[PDB]
């Protein structure tokens, strides 16, 4: 936490570098929170950006309605 | 006879900066003998570490439950047209690389050893994205996204539903839609100028930050306290005094530091409980004021509540309460009932209104005089039971159908 | 009316949901995780209180009888005083922690009391206060050092696209729905509620007239059915 490992699978984050876990570009649901926009999870252990949710862009119109 | 659209701001804190306290090197430093003597004090540092981790995860849970209210991220449509209404102040600016609204950017700009500042799980970026998704859901789907799946609705339809929820008919919406849009834009600009020109509008978050900083500074300064010892430096006592007593001096210094740490932990726990209560209140306001229309008075702003726009704040949340304020009252004459052929007529949803000569019916929240007919009135009882009944006739819409 | 239309379907859906969530409660230990964490905190407090008796507090022994029978009384009084004040500080720390936990538990109990006053003894119109979606009702249950409410909620599904209009201009007059909304399937306009699809013929019983149709924006032209003319034709 806050200790830069350049003067001590390496991924440098804002809180600190993570050793032993590889960074993945793809984003999934987090399991073990870490902080500073990153967290680790087990699937080997990997780290990825948080998945806020499924993207759903609703079509908006001033004359269209949706009735359940 | 007139209405005013007013925008009010409510600031509620969410959490604080997460702090981790290392007992061993703060109380005794790098001295091995002091650490060995501290090992005979029990599990005080372990208990404090457990309490601090519990406070940190409590703050994380509060931040998750106040911001991540929906599991679906909604994106604004490419066309930013809502019948003349303006929302660029609350929508994120694509020009800014931070993906934050100008109101959010101004709000962020207006807010400024053994202790490690643990960063929060949710930083500014995904909190701003959550607020943008919630704004898109409440500007496109209304309150339906908070009630299950997203049900698209036009903005005038949502506004008409919201004013129908507070007992105002939708006829006045179509007659003065441009007036409503202009009043909303003027109120948004006025509240933006007011928040830009008022440094004291962020008093709660600034006070919380100042209290945390003062607590950290006080804990730092307690290391220089002698606590009745010969000196405040452990190494000076070790290299200048006999051990037989020097161990008593070390014990006195470490129990003074432990008492100061206990005071800090109690203060942090009290502050965390207060902030948890404030975050529960903020979550209730997010669930009620923003995700729907609340009929509660004074809960979501002054007067009748229409909607609330959430914005991202540093260690807090700011609600843009847009409300309905009646204005320009006019004197009028009432009547308990209308006596027609020995029958008493009462309004179904409005009240009898008179300007001095004729008698009409109008809503409680707006002056909309209509002809007194049998469709909007019901008959229950005769005229001698009520007190102060006036004499007037009731127009029958069915009568001209068979008159000719 | 839709409740009486498909009452058997509603009952079957409710029974299936109740059975599914009853099966899911056994396989999900995270539901009672808050109560388990409270019990674990209680056990941790007891363990800390037990372990505090093993602390020497800078002395030579953790037993005061050993100090009394082992060390000279003129300074054994000071040693016993030091042990007394150390254990007193530990007890004060435990008391403050218990008081903070009591404040948190009292706040949670007040919140639960408010929830059972709102959406157990009656129907609450609050959105997502005690259940996701349009909350219908809740079923209170008893738990060890906790309370579980089986919240039943109304969730709309199977949305359909439709074309809507602010009003209907008929005979130079604008007609607004009293409680529903005007929808169009492509050729005809119908009125239905905002939470279900029940199309109906545009009739003056559920619509009111307020002004003409040249002041509104986005209106369409359609006739309005009134049964008075067919009643008076024959
Ligand atoms: C109700 O108040 C609004 C303003 O609060 C009035 O709108 C103004 O109307 C005058 C003339 O009609 C214009 O010169 C102003 O520019 C309008 N103000 C705004 C902010 O647009 C409105 O006329 C009032 N209605 C009644 C019936 O008195
Ligand atoms: C909505 O409000 C924004 C901000 O007030 C308007 O943007 C301004 O537009 C004028 C001229 O159109 C410029 O002189 C200002 O510099 C703009 N301000 C900012 C902050 O960009 C915008 O025109 C309004 N209307 C719409 C439809 O967006
Ligand atoms: C009270 O309101 C009624 C309705 O507007 C007024 O009656 C109209 O008054 C105007 C001008 O005085 C006349 O041109 C209309 O012919 C009247 N209508 C009818 C049906 O007769 C009435 O004058 C108002 N009373 C006061 C004291 O202002
Ligand atoms: C309003 O109408 C009522 C009923 O037509 C009037 O009440 C009558 O008053 C007279 C004398 O005041 C009595 O002899 C009748 O017995 C009353 N009838 C009833 C049904 O009460 C009343 O006077 C009228 N008010 C005004 C101001 O003209
Ligand atoms: C919209 O709905 C209406 C009523 O549900 C449809 O009108 C009916 O269409 C069927 C199909 O041919 C006819 O058999 C009926 O006689 C029609 N009823 C009336 C009262 O005209 C209409 O076709 C639907 N429109 C679309 C585009 O599906
Ligand atoms: C909807 O109905 C209105 C009124 O029936 C139409 O307005 C008239 O349109 C005709 C020709 O389109 C003109 O000659 C009249 O002068 C209009 N009257 C008024 C009061 O505006 C309107 O055009 C209709 N809309 C559509 C799309 O046909
Ligand atoms: C750690 O140090 C390296 C070089 O010493 C530097 O490039 C890097 O930015 C540092 N990491 C952080 C988070 O500052
Ligand atoms: C409604 O949308 C149409 C485009 O589909 C546009 O031409 C029209 O101007 C819009 N009306 C309002 C009041 O924004
Ligand atoms: C309604 O239409 C829009 C675009 O026209 C589409 O995105 C949406 O999926 C449609 N709704 C349904 C239920 O298919």
Curated annotation (Swiss-Prot), chain B:
Glycosylation sites: 2, 86, 331, 355, 391
Superkingdom of origin: Viruses
Chain spans, region Heptad repeat 1: 177-227
Known outcome of mutating residue 116 to N: In strain: Lambda/C.37
Record-annotated site: Cleavage: 100-101
Entry coiled-coil feature ranges: 206-250
Effect annotated for changing residue 284 to I: In strain: Gamma/P.1
Cysteine pairs bridged by disulfides in the record: 23-45, 28-34, 289-300, 339-383
Protein task: Precursor of the fusion protein processed in the biosynthesis of the S protein and the formation of virus particle. Mediates fusion of the virion and cellular membranes by functioning as a class I viral fusion protein. Contains two viral fusion peptides that are unmasked after cleavage. The S2/S2' cleavage occurs during virus entry at the cell membrane by host TMPRSS2 or during endocytosis by host CSTL.
Protein name per the record: Spike protein S2
Organism: Severe acute respiratory syndrome coronavirus 2 (2019-nCoV)
Span covered, complete protein: 716 to 1147 of 1273
């Amino acid at each position: 936490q806050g200790v830069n490992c350049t003067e001590v699978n390496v991924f440098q984050t804002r809180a600190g570098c993570l050793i032993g876990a590889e960074y993945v570009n793809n984003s999934y649901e987090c399991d073990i929170p870490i902080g500073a926009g990153i967290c680790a999870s087990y699937q080997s252990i990997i780290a990825y950006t948080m998945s806020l949710g499924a993207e759903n862009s609703v079509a908006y119109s001033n004359n269209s309605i949706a009735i359940p | 006879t007139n209405f005013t659209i007013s925008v009010t701001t409510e600031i509620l804190p969410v959490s604080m900066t997460k702090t981790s306290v290392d007992c061993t090197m703060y109380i005794c430093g790098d001295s091995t003998e002091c650490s060995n003597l501290l090992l005979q004090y029990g599990s005080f540092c372990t208990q404090l570490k457990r309490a601090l981790t519990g406070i940190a995860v409590e703050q994380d849970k509060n931040t998750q439950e106040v911001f991540a209210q929906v599991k679906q991220i909604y994106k604004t449509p490419p066309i930013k047209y809502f019948g003349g209404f303006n929302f660029s102040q609350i929508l994120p600016d694509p020009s800014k690389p931070s993906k934050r609204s100008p109101i959010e950017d101004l709000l962020f700009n207006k807010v400024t050893k053994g202790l490690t500042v643990l960063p929060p799980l949710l930083t500014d970026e995904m909190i701003a994205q959550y607020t943008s998704a919630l704004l898109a859901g409440t500007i496109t789907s209304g309150w339906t996204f908070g009630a299950g799946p997203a049900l698209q609705i036009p903005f005038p339809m949502q506004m008409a539903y919201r004013f129908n929820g507070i007992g105002v008919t939708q006829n006045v919406l179509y007659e003065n839609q441009k007036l409503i849009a202009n009043q909303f834009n003027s109120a948004i600009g006025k509240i933006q100028d007011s928040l830009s020109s008022t440094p004291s509008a962020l008093g709660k978050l600034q006070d919380v930050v100042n209290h945390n900083a003062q607590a950290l500074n006080t804990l730092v300064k307690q290391l220089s306290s002698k606590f009745g010892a010969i000196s405040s430096v452990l190494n000076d006592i070790f290299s200048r005094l006999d051990p037989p007593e020097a161990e008593v001096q070390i014990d006195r210094l470490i129990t003074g530091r432990l008492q100061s740490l206990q005071t800090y932990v109690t203060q942090q726990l009290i502050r965390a409980a207060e902030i948890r209560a404030s975050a529960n209140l903020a979550a209730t306001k997010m669930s009620e004021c923003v995700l729907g229309q609340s009929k509660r008075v004074d809960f979501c702003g002054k007067g009748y509540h229409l909607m609330s726009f959430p914005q991202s704040a540093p260690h807090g949340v700011v609600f843009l309460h847009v409300t309905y304020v009646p204005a320009q009252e006019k004197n009028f004459t009432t009547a308990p009932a209308i006596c027609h052929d020995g029958k008493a007529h009462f309004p179904r949803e409005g009240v009898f209104v008179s300007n001095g000569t004729h008698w009409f019916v109008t809503q409680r929240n707006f002056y909309e005089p209509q002809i007194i007919t049998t469709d909007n009135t019901f008959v229950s009882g005769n005229c001698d039971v009520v007190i102060g009944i006036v004499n007037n006739t009731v127009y029958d819409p069915l009568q001209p159908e068979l008159d000719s």
